[model samples]
Target: SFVGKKYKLDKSENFDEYMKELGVGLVTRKMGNSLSPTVEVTLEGDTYTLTTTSTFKTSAISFKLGVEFDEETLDGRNVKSIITLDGNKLTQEQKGDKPTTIVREFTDNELITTLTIGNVKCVRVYKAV
Candidate 1:
């Protein structure tokens, strides 16, 4: 199961460009690119919680698969998000003034997350810890 597995960020590609497309300021984009976060997933009954922790901040979201919910992004954007799981891939589609998509694909020892905004795609790789 993906539960109880903790993954640490190893590297990222084109994150700044992706953030820029979302209208994130320079400082916030730099701050976001510099931090390495650990991600974990937990489940309680029908709800699943995804937690991301770093020295900069800790964020968590709880939701059921395929249900839409309101989410305030780290960049302070208020959006509606829907998360769905298909095999080892968990995908979140955020709808707002500027829509975005995030897909987390899990392997035995790694988690790869792809963030997309407009035509830019940023990929972040995490190693199991």
Candidate 2:
């Protein structure tokens, strides 16, 4: 389990433009760009809690793998989401206008997240801290 570990944002690529494609507002977009977030993962039985924190905002979500549920996006949109686990990787999809696909994988004490929205793609790397 990759639980109870602290990960700090290491690098990001094409995030600003990608969020722009999502129609995120100005203030929130600025906050996101200047913030280096930290994420913590916790597992309890088959349920998992993911907590993401930064100077701008902090969000915590709890869910079970492979279960479909409604999720509110950071940019303030309601969408249907599902999380699925595959070995050391977790994949999530948000169904809506642009439609989003996220892949989170753990390797070499680092966590890598890839986000795809329509034609835009972004990658965020997090290192254990």
Candidate 3:
């Protein structure tokens, strides 16, 4: 049961900034494409563990769902921030102006991860593996 919390990608306040921070390729075309990430959260009271996986890589995070803690992205991007989760939503504040927030929701067995960057909104989907 505890092993499933490893493939979750939290939502961000914006995608453009995040993608840019993530250094996506010019051919990536962040928008107009579906990128769904699988997020499994296992919470025991205040402490929680989340797991998220994709073809790219797999990650696992553990912290107090609503509390803040430092996080370093897998890509070694400038993603130093405190990340947390409230309910089904994952939130964060990178070390920069205007903190970024990520929300997550699931329905009908599909996981929807949405990012809004400036005026851009991009989404991706992931099938449970």
Candidate 4:
């Protein structure tokens, strides 16, 4: 019942290894290491449909930029996220006391994104070549 027909993913590398090599802080690194995920995202005009499957869970959600909805991390952390897409960049800001945001962009045949967990910043890259 939760299958998406399309995905705008540029390229996603194994986040685990990227975090380790990039020296993402201890806590974030550990959490990222243990995450298991498979995401299918469908993009239609200004709207999006997403279906995610994982070892720990499976969920589906849909939204557009400047719209608000509840979001959860792969590891099951709860927060509200708002997505904004500008050009080839897709960014999201999650509501929390610490103010966190994530930015995903395509550059040089790669999908690159940075996760801000509280005060720690971690970057993840996926190759497209």
Each candidate structure's TM-score, on Cα atoms with residue i matched to residue i, is 0.95, 0.94, 0.56, 0.60
Model 4 C-alpha lDDT per residue in residues 1-129, reported as the tens digit of each score: 112332233334455554444445779767646664455556778788655555655676778878998886544557788988787677888775445677866556555677675445666554432
Model 2 residue runs over 4 Å out of place are: none
Whole-model lDDT, model 4: 0.61
List model 2 lDDT by residue over 1-129, tens digit each: 678888999999989977888888888787788788998888888889888998766898999988998999867888999999899998999998869998999888889999998888999999999
User: Among these predicted structures, which one has the highest lDDT?
Assistant: 1
Q: What TM-score does candidate 1 reach?
A: 0.95
Q: Rate the local accuracy (lDDT) of all candidates.
A: 0.91, 0.88, 0.52, 0.61
Model 1: runs farther than 4 Å from truth? Answer: none
Per-residue lDDT for 1-129 in model 3, tens only?
A: 322433334333445555664556544526412344566767766676667645555566777654556765433444446655545556555554433445444544545666544455556543444
Shift in Å, residue 129, candidate 4: 7.9
Please tell me which model should have the higher lDDT, number 1 or number 4. Answer: 1
